[PDB]
Design a protein around this ligand. Sequence first.
Ligand SMILES: Nc1ncnc2c1ncn2[C@@H]1O[C@H](COP(=O)(O)OP(=O)(O)O)[C@@H](O)[C@H]1O
Ligand SMILES: [Mg+2]
Lengths: 371, 56, 56, 77
Amino acid sequence: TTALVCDNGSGLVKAGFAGDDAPRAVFPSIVGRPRHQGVMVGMGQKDSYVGDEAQSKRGILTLKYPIEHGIITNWDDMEKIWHHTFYNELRVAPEEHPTLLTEAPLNPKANREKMTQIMFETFNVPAMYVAIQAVLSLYASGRTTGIVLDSGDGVTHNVPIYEGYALPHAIMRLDLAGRDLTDYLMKILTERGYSFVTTAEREIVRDIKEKLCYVALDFENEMATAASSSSLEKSYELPDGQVITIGNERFRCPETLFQPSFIGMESAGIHETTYNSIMKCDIDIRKDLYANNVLSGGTTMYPGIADRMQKEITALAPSTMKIKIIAPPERKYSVWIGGSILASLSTFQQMWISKQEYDEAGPSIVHRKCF
Amino acid sequence: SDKLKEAETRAEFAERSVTKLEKSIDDLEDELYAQKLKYKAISEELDHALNDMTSI
Amino acid sequence: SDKLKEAETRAEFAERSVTKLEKSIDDLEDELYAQKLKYKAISEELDHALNDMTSI
Amino acid sequence: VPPKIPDGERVDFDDIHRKRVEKDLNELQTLIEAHFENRKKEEEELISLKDRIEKRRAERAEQQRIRNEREKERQNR
Ligand SMILES: Nc1ncnc2c1ncn2[C@@H]1O[C@H](COP(=O)(O)OP(=O)(O)O)[C@@H](O)[C@H]1O
Ligand SMILES: [Mg+2]
């Protein structure tokens, strides 16, 4: 039979059968209970709208993501999300399909063990396998080397790989991602008068960020230009009218990636953690990693980031090496495409964690040889 | 009695006309607004295309 | 007498209302057509662009 | 110990052709076909239908003018 390539993610759940080009169903991972009282009788009001249904009734819900930073903080809601994904968005019972979840690097063990225990006890799948979210993004590019920066919505991690041999001592995981950029944008919009507070209006700020923000090639020059002319002010129409005008908030929101001091984080930007991740590698594979830097994940879709990052790394790196940044147009679904490719391989067909194996060793089987 | 009958019938006919006109107005309004949103969307995507051209 | 006075009065209101409704209907329809024609002119601009793109 | 992947045979970077070159031409041609058929179905029919509705609207206007004038002529007392 065919395998189910699910990809929990944090912000958008992407799923679909193995062997295709794009995920079949992509929908936000939010579960929102209603918060008001409700007076109409017999309206058929449910107790929790999940997935894309709660992005249409969000006016009277309190949306809450079940995955904070890679890790899962609310297991009941995550179980509800998985149940919805299997039964309503794909309509395939899990009793007859292997599953291939994905997990960020350096995550707590208990999260992974609970994930496999749920998949084997509640949904009762035949066999499931957990894979690191960066190796798949490297599969999708058709490479076999390269250092991949997978800046998702929950957590940004940077896994270097050479000739198929991952370097476990050079993984640099940073917890700045799309959600923190949304919060920072929502916080700097208040400088013009627009106040978004409700958890429903966070979605509106996210839409503003997606449609308007861009990464500046040079930050100081843009700050000077936006403060003199008015060629940058782009307007946007809220879900009820009252258009708003975003000035130099456009390139200040995604600039947080390269200067995490804006949101008070100490660490260095995504332009310098990649160079540090390279320098921890051996001295003989640094040229190949320099030449095959891969971008993935949703948050790396800002217009103009593949040039800013290249300029920064070229500034840091030695002058002789060639710096090349692979930015495929299908960046958002790169991890899932790689997952489909991996699940479609014949050599991989014996790596699944078969159910009888789980019955013999318990949930701690995932840390064992079947990784 | 005769005047009453004629007046009532004229009234009822005009009333039903009123209701049907309102319904027609509503439907044409929905279609026109959908066209308006379509136009705004096409213009906005056109401008995005222009800015994409500016990029590259 | 009360009945027929009422009926004629409300009928006159109905006639004036319905005529106002007809002016409204025509204005809305003509504006819709003008907007749709602007949209189709834009579509033929895009179609000339597509004929250029026939370069591919 | 870290997992040990059993040794296989092949391949990689050879499916990039079979997943890229396909849509490099088929997708472009199919989208061009879709745009052509949608424009043909939509624009000309919409303009013709709007002209037809405009003519019907003008006829309704004439009927309204005639009826209004005759009723005002009779009722004027
Ligand atoms: N076109 C875009 N431009 C800018 N940011 C985007 C765009 N699309 C998605 N994002 C950001 O990326 C996030 C989605 O990232 P995603 O790759 O789905 O995360 P995950 O790894 O959990 O799947 C969204 O929250 C949004 O903030
Ligand atoms: Mg991801």
